Amino acid sequence: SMNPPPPETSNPNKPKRQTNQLQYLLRVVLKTLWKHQFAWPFQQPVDAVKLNLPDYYKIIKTPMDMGTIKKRLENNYYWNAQECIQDFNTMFTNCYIYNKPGDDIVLMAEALEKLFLQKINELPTEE
Numbered sequence: 001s002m003n004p005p006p007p008e009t010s011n012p013n014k015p016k017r018q019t020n021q022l023q024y025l026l027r028v029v030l031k032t033l034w035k036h037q038f039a040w041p042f043q044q045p046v047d048a049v050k051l052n053l054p055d056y057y058k059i060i061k062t063p064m065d066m067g068t069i070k071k072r073l074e075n076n077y078y079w080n081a082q083e084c085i086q087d088f089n090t091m092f093t094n095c096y097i098y099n100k101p102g103d104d105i106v107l108m109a110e111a112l113e114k115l116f117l118q119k120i121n122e123l124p125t126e127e
């Protein structure tokens with residue numbers, strides 16, 4: 001029972017929406033990040049069991065990953081772009097909180113975050 005359940009990718013009680021900004025986040029931002037050579041460790045939830053990180057979910061209480069973000073986008077889980085941007089930010093910050101500066105995973109995260117920030121800089125106007 002070591003890993004927690006993953007973050008939800010759908011919810012019957014959460015209102016759903018498609019916006020051009022959310023479309024951009026899936027088509028341009030996530031797509032660009034997903035194919036980056038350092039993306040793979042972020043493409044699914046951290047498996048603290050398999051990775052032998054027994055304290056991971058003791059430290060990180062709001063886990064997030066690009067696999068979850070991808071599904072949320074594909075499922076129209078979000079109401080707005082801010083919610084999705086928040087998930088990306090949580091993913092990166094979690095990584096910086098858990099690992100030490102100069103760990104390879106942190107360098108990988110930093111590469112992805114730089115690219116993330118460049119793509120969301122050109123987030124289009126709503127509608």
Ligand SMILES: Cc1noc(C)c1-c1ccc2c(Nc3ccccc3C(C)(C)C)c(C(=O)O)cnc2n1
Nearest residue numbers: 040041042045046047051053094095098099104105
């Ligand atoms: C993401 C993330 N956030 O915190 C941690 C911790 C991770 C993380 C780190 C490594 C992962 C990983 N491979 C791995 C395992 C041990 C040492 C070094 C690495 C790499 C530098 C190659 C990433 C894998 C994997 O090998 O499948 C998956 N998720 C990981 N998450």
